[PDB]
């Protein structure tokens, strides 16, 4: 049964490759996401409706 | 004797190590950080325009890069390119087979893709030197049914197929270049990151894999859901993304922490999600449920911001323009609805 | 300056709208059918006969001025939960199943499970099913010689007798009819278990003969549309 | 992260009693429709049994009707199968499967060796 | 005078329910296009608009006339007479064609779906409308019927009642018995298989009562007036019984929308208001 053992070897090598990586704290990632959302906060017409003066759809 | 059992036990030991590593970098949470900020408030949206050109149910409804035109395909055998500003059908194209399940509008406004149960992907043309549209290039290298397609540049496009194998094509010649495998179930959708260097793919094996286009290997793999992954979308920043599954649960994942962030599940809904995408700023998250509604949530406060009624039948596709000026929805009632 | 941009767009819209209406007329004028089965039950042989003429293998035919496009999926994967939702608007599903392959590996139970999963579907709940009973001559050959016994694979078969409203063909032993009607009313029971008041089922005994069969599916689509029209008006 | 395990198995003479316990982890056990499916060496997969969302509906195949009994339990999130008077033809490998979608009765896990909710399995074989 | 003051109340409540329901149904069919995308709905929406026409323009005049006993502002009541019938027979005609299309939708659905086009529905509606109009306006407008609570000449009223009532009710009876026979056949066919699979009359009476309620009201509330339309020319009961009979004949058309508009999806369309 070469197929099963080959699939198992490929899976364990993929897991070994996935295990060799670093991470970061979740609070820093959340803070960066909030910083990005605030930096792009005033450019979201869907967030706050814009007047019909410049709206092309309305 | 039987070293495959030893391989399996060391694989599960590596899995336990990965779980411990993910638990190590999770001292804090997200719901405690999003506090002290103002909520989005009860936003009320009104449907702006409706399109009546289709016979059967719409399935893909891919938007356009110029933020004015759009494309749509249904199970009737027609591909319709619409103008949203004047409510006019720009183009109508008859297809080879009736069944279609995805489109891919090129970022140059020159090409458009299709695909369905025919295991082939057609690429048409829009800069008509003779006026009429014609099939410009066919791609047939997969056995399973096509699920989604997203153009990368003017001469290559990555597709996902039902045979647990996705590929990158080279339509300039007619042969594929890179092949991504690893999923056990058929891959359901994919989403290209704004970096144009890597993309996320979601399948039915309750997983989501981050592939590199130029390398061909799998960088990260997330398994947080418990059912099929129907839709997957990427955050506009490039460090997170969202996924909508078939168990009334949508989840926000990130790439740096290699673990889920927060789930937008609710008690009163039991139906499934079919399409989900982000907004211009990512503060709002729109998801198309299966109970004939569309729920927009606050991506930070984990609370419902608005509910969109309308289509009597199930909504199958949802899209947001690049500039974030309006939203478009497509359901199984032959109706395309553009909201503002 | 928007004079030229408006008139060309308007005339293009009008032309393509007239064309799509003319083609929608034809689309409404025809019908669609989806053929499937448990596998190895003779799909090639029946498509040689039923159609009388690459995942989606399609065959278009016409009888009495109404057209039918039969779609086959004999070039797809094994999992059938994601792609099967595309066939929501199809009016009929021809479920061809073998009735003598119960021993060679409980294929009857597989077909029954497939029928039960299709019948209780969220989106396929409004789609009637046409049912064929293939290889009846093989049933007769296997019960007469003594190749196998249904009682081993179905304990309740011992407490079942042939109904009186049956149509036994002359010159046929009662055991063939007993087994065939047992399969038939097992299918009918697993169909009528749930019920909706929206769709139904129709059994048939064919594919044992190589004669004409297009009349059966024609009459089935006809009275299915008749029943759905009766249900629409609440007069049913 | 979905995960399934099962306890049971042995080489017992024909005419005994065997108990298998399938345990699940990574999802709400009180919402789905568990089922057991087996396959024999040299044959394909054969649907064996299923348990509904609550336990009111019970369905067995023809070959096992009135002999082998099943029962779920949401407290331990485990489902128990009981082989009583094991026939010499039950020398097969068993798997405890789960339907892909909740609240729906459409369940087919007999697919050929590719599934995301089928456990490791257990090789039950009678003695001589 | 307790009887006098409540007759106005009763008739005004009747016409109020009539008009409110008719405006509700036409607003429901004009608000959304998802229901109007089916050719079969054109006949019923034309029926509703014609019933609105008979409700708004002719009935209140007779109502205010009888409550006082006179005809205030009497200079065009004869001209009004055509109005009072121009819709009426039209409504009846609508009913009949309704039945007939259902026949085409049951006997041979294939030929019906292949031949009947949205243009044919408009053609039939136009034919019914012009057959009502030409038989209503042209005769009475010139000289052909000679305090305007007048009589009907023998030369026109009998044949007008024959054409407007007898032939449509006869063809409706024929089509209804035919569809009842075919429904009994289908019920026997499905019940045989049901009884064979489980190993009846409770289902076979529903179709009977359903064809009885849709047709029985029409005859039950349109036959006395139309049959008295023959005795009075050559009579001889009273001048009031004819009035109550035409009142019942108008109440029939007032109430028929509750029967001919209550399908399930359109009931939801009513519910979303
Ligand atoms: C002036 C006058 C005199 C007697 C009766 C009537 C009624 C009018 N209302 C009731 C409509 C019904 C109708 C009538 C007369 C007809 O000849 C006719 O064919 C119809 Cl349908 C009108």
PDB file of C-alpha atoms in Angstrom, chain E residues 33-177:
ATOM      1  CA  UNK E  33     -43.733  42.590 -10.263  1.00  0.00           C
ATOM      2  CA  UNK E  34     -42.827  39.104  -9.008  1.00  0.00           C
ATOM      3  CA  UNK E  35     -46.516  38.130  -9.042  1.00  0.00           C
ATOM      4  CA  UNK E  36     -47.340  39.940 -12.302  1.00  0.00           C
ATOM      5  CA  UNK E  37     -44.675  37.903 -14.145  1.00  0.00           C
ATOM      6  CA  UNK E  38     -47.211  35.073 -14.589  1.00  0.00           C
ATOM      7  CA  UNK E  39     -49.651  35.293 -17.507  1.00  0.00           C
ATOM      8  CA  UNK E  40     -52.466  33.727 -15.478  1.00  0.00           C
ATOM      9  CA  UNK E  41     -52.595  36.752 -13.153  1.00  0.00           C
ATOM     10  CA  UNK E  42     -53.589  39.179 -15.930  1.00  0.00           C
ATOM     11  CA  UNK E  43     -57.137  37.803 -16.016  1.00  0.00           C
ATOM     12  CA  UNK E  44     -57.617  38.148 -12.261  1.00  0.00           C
ATOM     13  CA  UNK E  45     -56.131  41.646 -12.106  1.00  0.00           C
ATOM     14  CA  UNK E  46     -58.436  42.711 -14.946  1.00  0.00           C
ATOM     15  CA  UNK E  47     -61.323  41.152 -13.014  1.00  0.00           C
ATOM     16  CA  UNK E  48     -60.291  43.164  -9.953  1.00  0.00           C
ATOM     17  CA  UNK E  49     -60.018  46.439 -11.875  1.00  0.00           C
ATOM     18  CA  UNK E  50     -63.418  45.876 -13.505  1.00  0.00           C
ATOM     19  CA  UNK E  51     -64.942  45.114 -10.104  1.00  0.00           C
ATOM     20  CA  UNK E  52     -63.395  48.341  -8.818  1.00  0.00           C
ATOM     21  CA  UNK E  53     -64.992  50.109 -11.792  1.00  0.00           C
ATOM     22  CA  UNK E  54     -68.450  48.736 -10.967  1.00  0.00           C
ATOM     23  CA  UNK E  55     -67.905  49.537  -7.278  1.00  0.00           C
ATOM     24  CA  UNK E  56     -66.873  53.171  -7.679  1.00  0.00           C
ATOM     25  CA  UNK E  57     -69.080  54.521 -10.455  1.00  0.00           C
ATOM     26  CA  UNK E  58     -72.565  52.965 -10.482  1.00  0.00           C
ATOM     27  CA  UNK E  59     -73.473  51.286  -7.176  1.00  0.00           C
ATOM     28  CA  UNK E  60     -73.276  54.359  -4.872  1.00  0.00           C
ATOM     29  CA  UNK E  61     -75.697  56.199  -7.173  1.00  0.00           C
ATOM     30  CA  UNK E  62     -78.391  53.545  -6.755  1.00  0.00           C
ATOM     31  CA  UNK E  63     -77.517  53.439  -3.047  1.00  0.00           C
ATOM     32  CA  UNK E  64     -78.161  57.154  -2.502  1.00  0.00           C
ATOM     33  CA  UNK E  65     -81.195  56.920  -4.804  1.00  0.00           C
ATOM     34  CA  UNK E  66     -83.062  54.191  -2.930  1.00  0.00           C
ATOM     35  CA  UNK E  67     -82.245  55.497   0.566  1.00  0.00           C
ATOM     36  CA  UNK E  68     -84.223  58.656  -0.249  1.00  0.00           C
ATOM     37  CA  UNK E  69     -86.747  57.267  -2.748  1.00  0.00           C
ATOM     38  CA  UNK E  70     -85.935  59.793  -5.499  1.00  0.00           C
ATOM     39  CA  UNK E  71     -83.219  60.356  -8.113  1.00  0.00           C
ATOM     40  CA  UNK E  72     -81.518  63.682  -7.343  1.00  0.00           C
ATOM     41  CA  UNK E  73     -79.798  65.402 -10.276  1.00  0.00           C
ATOM     42  CA  UNK E  74     -81.639  63.373 -12.894  1.00  0.00           C
ATOM     43  CA  UNK E  75     -80.403  64.182 -16.389  1.00  0.00           C
ATOM     44  CA  UNK E  76     -78.086  61.295 -17.412  1.00  0.00           C
ATOM     45  CA  UNK E  77     -79.313  58.269 -15.440  1.00  0.00           C
ATOM     46  CA  UNK E  78     -80.183  56.564 -18.729  1.00  0.00           C
ATOM     47  CA  UNK E  79     -76.612  57.354 -19.791  1.00  0.00           C
ATOM     48  CA  UNK E  80     -75.613  55.920 -16.407  1.00  0.00           C
ATOM     49  CA  UNK E  81     -77.605  52.755 -17.175  1.00  0.00           C
ATOM     50  CA  UNK E  82     -75.076  51.651 -19.804  1.00  0.00           C
ATOM     51  CA  UNK E  83     -72.339  52.141 -17.206  1.00  0.00           C
ATOM     52  CA  UNK E  84     -74.246  49.990 -14.709  1.00  0.00           C
ATOM     53  CA  UNK E  85     -74.219  47.104 -17.206  1.00  0.00           C
ATOM     54  CA  UNK E  86     -71.010  47.898 -19.122  1.00  0.00           C
ATOM     55  CA  UNK E  87     -68.996  46.553 -16.198  1.00  0.00           C
ATOM     56  CA  UNK E  88     -71.493  43.924 -15.068  1.00  0.00           C
ATOM     57  CA  UNK E  89     -71.539  41.574 -18.059  1.00  0.00           C
ATOM     58  CA  UNK E  90     -67.825  42.333 -18.447  1.00  0.00           C
ATOM     59  CA  UNK E  91     -67.215  40.988 -14.945  1.00  0.00           C
ATOM     60  CA  UNK E  92     -69.283  37.907 -15.797  1.00  0.00           C
ATOM     61  CA  UNK E  93     -67.313  37.443 -19.016  1.00  0.00           C
ATOM     62  CA  UNK E  94     -64.075  37.669 -17.033  1.00  0.00           C
ATOM     63  CA  UNK E  95     -65.266  34.884 -14.731  1.00  0.00           C
ATOM     64  CA  UNK E  96     -66.036  32.605 -17.666  1.00  0.00           C
ATOM     65  CA  UNK E  97     -62.686  33.099 -19.389  1.00  0.00           C
ATOM     66  CA  UNK E  98     -61.030  32.431 -16.028  1.00  0.00           C
ATOM     67  CA  UNK E  99     -62.625  28.990 -15.941  1.00  0.00           C
ATOM     68  CA  UNK E 100     -61.710  28.274 -19.540  1.00  0.00           C
ATOM     69  CA  UNK E 101     -57.990  28.892 -19.069  1.00  0.00           C
ATOM     70  CA  UNK E 102     -57.981  26.538 -16.096  1.00  0.00           C
ATOM     71  CA  UNK E 103     -59.414  23.923 -18.451  1.00  0.00           C
ATOM     72  CA  UNK E 104     -56.518  24.495 -20.844  1.00  0.00           C
ATOM     73  CA  UNK E 105     -54.202  24.217 -17.829  1.00  0.00           C
ATOM     74  CA  UNK E 106     -55.471  20.721 -16.888  1.00  0.00           C
ATOM     75  CA  UNK E 107     -56.476  18.770 -19.998  1.00  0.00           C
ATOM     76  CA  UNK E 108     -53.359  19.374 -22.133  1.00  0.00           C
ATOM     77  CA  UNK E 109     -50.684  21.343 -20.249  1.00  0.00           C
ATOM     78  CA  UNK E 110     -48.101  20.885 -23.015  1.00  0.00           C
ATOM     79  CA  UNK E 111     -50.152  22.514 -25.781  1.00  0.00           C
ATOM     80  CA  UNK E 112     -51.256  25.197 -23.313  1.00  0.00           C
ATOM     81  CA  UNK E 113     -47.685  26.113 -22.371  1.00  0.00           C
ATOM     82  CA  UNK E 114     -46.584  25.943 -26.018  1.00  0.00           C
ATOM     83  CA  UNK E 115     -49.441  27.950 -27.592  1.00  0.00           C
ATOM     84  CA  UNK E 116     -50.832  30.337 -24.961  1.00  0.00           C
ATOM     85  CA  UNK E 117     -48.683  33.485 -25.022  1.00  0.00           C
ATOM     86  CA  UNK E 118     -48.980  36.740 -23.010  1.00  0.00           C
ATOM     87  CA  UNK E 119     -50.306  38.305 -26.215  1.00  0.00           C
ATOM     88  CA  UNK E 120     -53.200  35.827 -26.215  1.00  0.00           C
ATOM     89  CA  UNK E 121     -54.182  36.907 -22.698  1.00  0.00           C
ATOM     90  CA  UNK E 122     -54.332  40.550 -23.795  1.00  0.00           C
ATOM     91  CA  UNK E 123     -56.308  39.488 -26.879  1.00  0.00           C
ATOM     92  CA  UNK E 124     -58.869  37.612 -24.775  1.00  0.00           C
ATOM     93  CA  UNK E 125     -59.180  40.481 -22.280  1.00  0.00           C
ATOM     94  CA  UNK E 126     -59.681  42.948 -25.136  1.00  0.00           C
ATOM     95  CA  UNK E 127     -62.278  40.700 -26.790  1.00  0.00           C
ATOM     96  CA  UNK E 128     -64.238  40.390 -23.544  1.00  0.00           C
ATOM     97  CA  UNK E 129     -64.057  44.142 -22.916  1.00  0.00           C
ATOM     98  CA  UNK E 130     -65.186  45.082 -26.434  1.00  0.00           C
ATOM     99  CA  UNK E 131     -67.962  42.466 -26.395  1.00  0.00           C
ATOM    100  CA  UNK E 132     -69.260  44.037 -23.181  1.00  0.00           C
ATOM    101  CA  UNK E 133     -68.816  47.621 -24.403  1.00  0.00           C
ATOM    102  CA  UNK E 134     -70.412  47.270 -27.842  1.00  0.00           C
ATOM    103  CA  UNK E 135     -73.377  45.365 -26.384  1.00  0.00           C
ATOM    104  CA  UNK E 136     -73.681  47.939 -23.584  1.00  0.00           C
ATOM    105  CA  UNK E 137     -73.211  51.390 -25.143  1.00  0.00           C
ATOM    106  CA  UNK E 138     -74.306  51.256 -28.805  1.00  0.00           C
ATOM    107  CA  UNK E 139     -77.900  49.958 -28.294  1.00  0.00           C
ATOM    108  CA  UNK E 140     -79.001  52.063 -25.323  1.00  0.00           C
ATOM    109  CA  UNK E 141     -77.093  55.207 -26.337  1.00  0.00           C
ATOM    110  CA  UNK E 142     -79.099  55.791 -29.510  1.00  0.00           C
ATOM    111  CA  UNK E 143     -82.728  54.670 -29.139  1.00  0.00           C
ATOM    112  CA  UNK E 144     -82.967  51.015 -28.126  1.00  0.00           C
ATOM    113  CA  UNK E 145     -84.626  51.161 -24.682  1.00  0.00           C
ATOM    114  CA  UNK E 146     -87.838  53.182 -24.381  1.00  0.00           C
ATOM    115  CA  UNK E 147     -88.216  58.413 -12.281  1.00  0.00           C
ATOM    116  CA  UNK E 148     -85.875  56.600 -14.675  1.00  0.00           C
ATOM    117  CA  UNK E 149     -86.498  53.359 -12.806  1.00  0.00           C
ATOM    118  CA  UNK E 150     -87.810  52.245 -16.189  1.00  0.00           C
ATOM    119  CA  UNK E 151     -88.744  48.946 -17.830  1.00  0.00           C
ATOM    120  CA  UNK E 152     -86.864  46.721 -20.268  1.00  0.00           C
ATOM    121  CA  UNK E 153     -88.215  46.113 -23.762  1.00  0.00           C
ATOM    122  CA  UNK E 154     -88.908  42.514 -24.756  1.00  0.00           C
ATOM    123  CA  UNK E 155     -86.813  42.975 -27.900  1.00  0.00           C
ATOM    124  CA  UNK E 156     -83.406  43.290 -26.188  1.00  0.00           C
ATOM    125  CA  UNK E 157     -83.439  42.251 -22.523  1.00  0.00           C
ATOM    126  CA  UNK E 158     -84.140  38.543 -23.080  1.00  0.00           C
ATOM    127  CA  UNK E 159     -81.372  37.998 -25.638  1.00  0.00           C
ATOM    128  CA  UNK E 160     -79.005  40.217 -23.638  1.00  0.00           C
ATOM    129  CA  UNK E 161     -79.556  38.023 -20.579  1.00  0.00           C
ATOM    130  CA  UNK E 162     -79.075  34.926 -22.756  1.00  0.00           C
ATOM    131  CA  UNK E 163     -75.743  36.146 -24.135  1.00  0.00           C
ATOM    132  CA  UNK E 164     -74.405  37.719 -20.937  1.00  0.00           C
ATOM    133  CA  UNK E 165     -75.418  35.036 -18.422  1.00  0.00           C
ATOM    134  CA  UNK E 166     -76.689  31.768 -19.917  1.00  0.00           C
ATOM    135  CA  UNK E 167     -73.847  30.883 -22.308  1.00  0.00           C
ATOM    136  CA  UNK E 168     -70.998  31.749 -19.877  1.00  0.00           C
ATOM    137  CA  UNK E 169     -72.623  29.910 -16.965  1.00  0.00           C
ATOM    138  CA  UNK E 170     -73.246  26.918 -19.244  1.00  0.00           C
ATOM    139  CA  UNK E 171     -69.656  26.732 -20.486  1.00  0.00           C
ATOM    140  CA  UNK E 172     -68.450  27.257 -16.906  1.00  0.00           C
ATOM    141  CA  UNK E 173     -70.610  24.353 -15.711  1.00  0.00           C
ATOM    142  CA  UNK E 174     -69.252  22.186 -18.537  1.00  0.00           C
ATOM    143  CA  UNK E 175     -65.595  22.975 -17.816  1.00  0.00           C
ATOM    144  CA  UNK E 176     -66.111  22.577 -14.066  1.00  0.00           C
ATOM    145  CA  UNK E 177     -67.685  19.129 -14.411  1.00  0.00           C
TER     146      UNK E 177
END
